[model samples]
Target: MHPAGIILTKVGYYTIPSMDDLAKITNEKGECIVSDFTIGRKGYGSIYFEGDVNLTNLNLDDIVHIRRKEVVVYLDDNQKPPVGEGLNRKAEVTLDGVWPTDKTSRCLIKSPDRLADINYEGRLEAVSRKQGAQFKEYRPETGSWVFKVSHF
Candidate 1:
């Protein structure tokens, strides 16, 4: 057997009713009960029944109740490092594109006319004068030069 915990009565992604399906019918008793109603618009969700479920002689409209442990575990990189408040660094450069290899750094600087002639996938990064003292005088310095830098 596999080393995974197998669960019963798990609601699949597509098996759940849609918005249009929820707009449909019920019994003639003038009552309909939706135990677990999930909210997902253009996204995905599921319901996992954690205990053993007896499905042998189950009736059609029988309510098979089960216990639920709403557990949320932040595993591995799921707990990302906090983006601390302070200086947000951004490098300004002019080049075609970059495909960084390993820990070593690489840079390419080119002239305006010749650099425009070359075709390469890259983006530009410039600072506005309204970005405070650290980005002051960047308006005139970043006139015609296209700049971009990325970390891999």
Candidate 2:
């Protein structure tokens, strides 16, 4: 799963219809069918049913559905920030690609490849010609970089 900004985007699922099973089950007493779409992808070329059913003395086949969520785009440090008067602020974010420890602060710089010597404390005050002046902090927590945007 990927966290884009404040939204969490990933693949999900949904359930649909099964004509063959439906026909057979209907021959029995009250029938019931339940579908849920919140995991993977729905089966291809499968009919879907969305209604209530009563499972009293009927035999029903188990149906499975899966679906994928749409891709989402989020604002990163490399992108510009939306400001008033149609003047967007450009931000320069840097990542150390490593987690912070007692010896390292996991420095974040405003401009890329420009402030190599500035420590984490100094990066907070660094200025840039870009409209959005900010720094992004990325720390290695779970073998990956977690991004956080800071405003100037």
Candidate 3:
């Protein structure tokens, strides 16, 4: 429980639908219904849910989700924040793959090359760039060389 009154849920980086799965879960409006979507940087973040999700809006690369959530409280840093934004919520992936971790953070400066190497056990870990945010700047600056975290 948080002092702020927000209840959270922990999907725990379960299996995200495969690209083939995303193809079938569309609603009447043709938008996808995605749940348990998550991501973060430098540690701590949000879990998003929506019935009208757009595959083109995924902005963050390091997110994990429960296959689905309706019950249970989750903790990031051991505290649950507000649930999150709606379907308008999602991450942006530029590479063909993506990953979420037991340690989701770091603005993780891994570019597409590094992304191809991502293969979290049981996670779909696929990625693609959405329309906004740091969608194109693949290499984040850090003193000098680019870095990556293969796992937590």
Top TM-score prediction, candidate number: 3
Runs of candidate 2 with Cα error greater than 4 angstroms are 1-118, 127-131, 134-152
Q: In model 1, which range of ten residues has the least summed lDDT?
A: 64-73
lDDT string for model 1 (92-120, tens) is 32211222222344344333443344322
Q: Sort by lDDT, best first.
A: 3, 2, 1
lDDT of each: 0.24, 0.27, 0.31
RMSD of each predicted structure: 22.1, 18.4, 15.9
Residue range 29-119, candidate 2, lDDT tens digits: 3343333211123221122222343222221112222212111112243543333101121122232233223335556334433333435
Candidate 2, residue 15: lDDT: 21
Model 2 local distance difference test score: 0.27
Model 3 TM-score (2 dp): 0.21
The clash numbers for all candidates, in the given order, read 1, 18, 17
